[PDB]
Amino acid sequence: KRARSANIPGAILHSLAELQDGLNAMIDPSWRAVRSLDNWALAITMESTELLDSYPWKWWKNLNATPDLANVRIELVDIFHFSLSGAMQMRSTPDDEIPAASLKPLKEVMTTFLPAKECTSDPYGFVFFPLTDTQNAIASFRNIIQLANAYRFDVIIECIIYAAEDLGFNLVAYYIAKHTLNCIRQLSGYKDGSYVKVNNGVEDNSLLHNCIKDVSLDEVLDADKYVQAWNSIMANVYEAFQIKESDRKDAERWFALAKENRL
Amino acid sequence: ANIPGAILHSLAELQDGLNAMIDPSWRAVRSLDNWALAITMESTELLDSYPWKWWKNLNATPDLANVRIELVDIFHFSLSGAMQMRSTPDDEIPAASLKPLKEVMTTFLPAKECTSDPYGFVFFPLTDTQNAIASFRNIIQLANAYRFDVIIECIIYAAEDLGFNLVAYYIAKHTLNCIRQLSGYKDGSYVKVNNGVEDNSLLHNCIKDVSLDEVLDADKYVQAWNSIMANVYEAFQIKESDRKDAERWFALAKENRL
Ligand SMILES: O=c1ccn([C@H]2C[C@H](O)[C@@H](CO)O2)c(=O)[nH]1
Ligand SMILES: O=c1ccn([C@H]2C[C@H](O)[C@@H](CO)O2)c(=O)[nH]1
């Protein structure tokens, strides 16, 4: 009986897209009309450098620092949100509005950065392992920025999947946890000043780690168990931030809202 | 309003000196990619001064004070990269640096009509968030193609559009960068920000009344730079014996060039 890998199945990625759609709609109901392909590319650019700032890349400051891999995990998940949004916006975009660079061959619109020291990479050759190494991370994310600039949101999703695998965490489980926090943020006034990330010492991102301790790679991808698996993660995050029941949503509600919008 | 060539050449010498203070053989230790990365990272710090997020803090205003600082940080790194290219043997020169600009980037353009610098990479007014975004997504691509040259030119046009004195700000942040190395930045005994007080933000009042003519005058500039240096040193209460002046840095650089 064959072990399931990290290589998110089509059906699972569609369900993820429905959650992403729901979250984006909380932010603006007409989000596909108001957002641009460049917004998502910019967002990925900005998170890519935030992620890189988790590593000790600076030679003039804090010379003995080590990588903050907990922050890297969350940032990879943030990049996944934006890339998934971009890949789905690209499917929604009319062909006369499709930017020429997305259709040009990659070689023409990017130069691939390689680390100096021998390493393994993902199948495209854009991301480099191990990601515990700062030089590997630097070349990887310099490559991701260039992919974003040529609108290759789907290539980026693939890379992030291989990255999560190298770093040995459950991408999908983290996605669900952060997706739930993102929803909580919007409910709680992130747009105006009302909600702030830092709450009496700790960043809100930091509470998600315990919310996904009890989930397995299979639990979260398996057609039979995933809806319940996802729902328990949402529940853990909601309960962590003391969100009343009437404000919560379960996975099946997000699928339903996605489907009715599909009319 | 643009920096005479001979002034640039002298800024490079202060930059050389600051880099040597950080690592004695900086040219052999650092790589082209180090500087290109630095510029990338500072470019996103610059964009993060603008209200670019559509999901959060929707009434935020651009922090153009911080943009001034970041432009000057990119300036430090772009001067360093340009010098690195000059010292890199031809057979180690990355091939992307020799290609026509059209081949190594896709020029992002804002949606709304605007003016730009002469290359068409930076867009005015830089008070506008989308103009800034398209500008620094272009700068990042220039860094990837090792075009430190072009970047320097773009930053100069940026400073002109934003109506501040690029050279004065450079000398001020340069001085701070020295102050940081003196105070133990490398081992964490000195921090850039604590209790809502960021060291960069105290620089503005040190150069408030400094004219463009002073700092660019190919015969008055040394004295002008020195007063900026002294004002920054004084604002951070640095001992006289821990201070260095322009001629010291020039002399260091002229001495190290043998
Ligand atoms: O339209 C948006 C805007 C923001 N985010 C998420 C992505 C990221 O995880 C978080 C900000 O760090 O907000 C979205 O998913 N969609
Ligand atoms: O080798 C270096 C390393 C850092 N810095 C300065 C540049 C920038 O102004 C500041 C960090 O923002 O440190 C240099 O000038 N040279």
TrEMBL record, chain A:
Q: Which residues bind Mg(2+)?
A: E47, E50, E75, D78
The residues that hold Ca(2+) are E47, E50, E75, D78
Q: What is its EC number?
A: 3.6.1.23
Q: Which UniProt keywords apply?
A: Calcium, Hydrolase, Metal-binding
Top-rank lineage group of the source organism: Eukaryota
Q: Which SUPFAM superfamilies has this protein been placed in?
A: all-alpha NTP pyrophosphatases (SSF101386)
**Glycoprotein is among the record's keywords:** no
Look up keyword Metal-binding and say if it applies. Answer: yes
Q: Which GO terms describe its cellular component?
A: nucleoplasm
A single Gene Ontology MF term assigned here is: dUTP diphosphatase activity
Q: Which Gene3D superfamilies match?
A: Type II deoxyuridine triphosphatase (1.20.1670.10)
Protein residues bound to dUMP:
Q20, N24, K58, W59, W60, D78, K178, N182, R185, Y190, K197
Per UniProt, what is one Pfam family of this protein? dUTPase_2
Question: Know the name of this protein?
Answer: Putative deoxyuridine triphosphatase
> Source taxonomy lineage?
Eukaryota, Discoba, Euglenozoa, Kinetoplastea, Metakinetoplastina
